[PDB]
């Protein structure tokens, strides 16, 4: 097995990456929740998806905090009581108010809780010794999440900003693969190029829906043939990435 | 003496009719909310629409208590926050849990409040001096509600039991027309025959969707031809019935 300290290079660089994304998450969530508290629906809607990109890019770490992640990011699908669940809070609760209902009424406390929760997450990440097995395992976890809910447009059922989250997951996974390139190369000379090709295929389909202002079209614009073309490469990436924990001597 | 055709007669009889329906509403609501608290989803679903018929038949009086009516019977449409509104309670809040979400989780307090609210309504109706203009105008008020939400199937957006509510509104309006028939036919017997024929047309179409028990098909079963055939009679009735207050000197 591989001693975690032998992976300090890529693990340290990943914590720097996660920390930078978390700093941006906090600053964007401050602005997003301030807009909600101020009743500025248009500004809140514009900030929603760009803010979430920073969370979706660091899911391998955020999901280590199971209850906090649920507070920040649970979907309607996660609640027996649906949209009416008292425990349905965070981004998707505000997504419903802003995009389906066009309101900020009584959303102030939900916005305040979301800001408090992301500031909590920032502190927990600062305190965290990053386990390389969770980092390395995180790329496969991200691609499994893409396969489960993002290809089908089931992450943002009211704003339909799923492509922002999709691209964030992919970017967060590619970052992990890139950082561990030397360690992968020591055991498997062909692996990085194999996954790079499938990442490039996914990135090219996603790029068909980027906008000049720096965003994405809504999910209803994604053609059925592009949706179908994503399934294969995403599944092959998930399978390939699922071998890395073992290959690198972490489990 | 009191004249034999004095309006104190039919208004008294309407309070009896409303009182009898509210007695049934309380007993059925007890059984409906008991099932919700028990977790018996199948029984609660079967009791939902027959319970509501008694409320829908007396809406001219129930809607005089604005906050109570909202607590018992508001729709998602009535809430800026939609399904997540804390003040979304009563029949349609439980309708969402039972029919959309297939759950009774945490619905106990909502069921307790619905039973308490209909018991409140029962006491308020007993204490109420019925305003004769609200009684006589109640037939038009009910037909306007049919035209606004029942004919288009927008009353029960999760259970789709709108035909029960449709028929209940129609029956409650026909009761008012029948009670004031002696006074109306003093003034305009041709007008009364015109109203009866449109009621008979509506009842004949609705009867096409009755089931073997005193039930109705769900709204999706209503053929588009039968929907368009309902539109004319309902709108003629809404206009004709809007003249009753003036015909009886209550404007």
Numbering used by the authors:
A (entry chain A), B (entry chain B): 35 to 285
Question: What do the authors say?
Answer:
EfeUOB/M has been characterised in Pseudomonas syringae pathovar. syringae as a novel type of ferrous-iron transporter, consisting of an inner-membrane protein (EfeUPsy) and three periplasmic proteins (EfeOPsy, EfeMPsy and EfeBPsy). EfeMPsy is an ‘M75-only’ EfeO-like protein with a C-terminal peptidase-M75 domain (EfeOII/EfeM family). Here we report the X-ray structure determination and bioanalytical characterisation of EfeMPsy from Pseudomonas syringae pv. syringae B728a; an EfeM family member that shares ~ 60% sequence identity with EfeO of E. coli K-12 in an effort to understand the role of this protein family member in the EfeUOB/M systems in bacteria. The work reported here introduces EfeMPsy as the best candidate to mark the beginning of the journey for a more detailed understanding of the periplasmic components, EfeO (EfeOI family) and EfeM (EfeOII family) and thereby offers support for the suggestion that these proteins contribute to iron transport in the EfeUOB(M) system, acting as periplasmic iron-binding proteins.
Herein, we report a structure solution of the apo form of EfeMPsy by molecular replacement. The refined structure of EfeMPsy consists of two identical EfeMPsy monomers (chain A, residues A35-A285, and chain B, residues B35-B285) in the asymmetric unit. Close examination of the overall structure shows that EfeMPsy is composed of two major α-helical bundles designated as ‘B1’ and ‘B2’. A flexible loop (residues 162–165, highlighted as ‘IDH’ in Fig. 1a) separates the B1 (residues 36–161) and B2 bundles (residues 166–285). Comparison of the folds (EfeMPsy vs pSBPs) suggests that some of the key structural characteristics of pSBPs are retained by EfeMPsy; the presence of two discrete domains linked by a hinge region, and the presence of an inter-domain ligand-binding cleft. Moreover, the inter-domain hinge region of EfeMPsy is smaller, consisting of only four residues which may reflect the relative size of ligand, in this case a metal ion, and potentially the lack of necessity to undergo any substantial opening/closing of the cleft to facilitate ligand binding. In this work, a closer examination of the structure of EfeMPsy has revealed two potential metal binding sites. The metal binding cleft, Site III, is nestled in between the two alpha helix bundles B1 and B2. Based on these observations, arising from the crystal structure, up to five residues (Tyr82, His126, Glu129, Glu189 and Asp190) can be considered potential metal ligands at Site III.Assessment of the structure for other potential metal binding sites, suggests a potential second metal binding site for these EfeO/EfeM family of proteins.
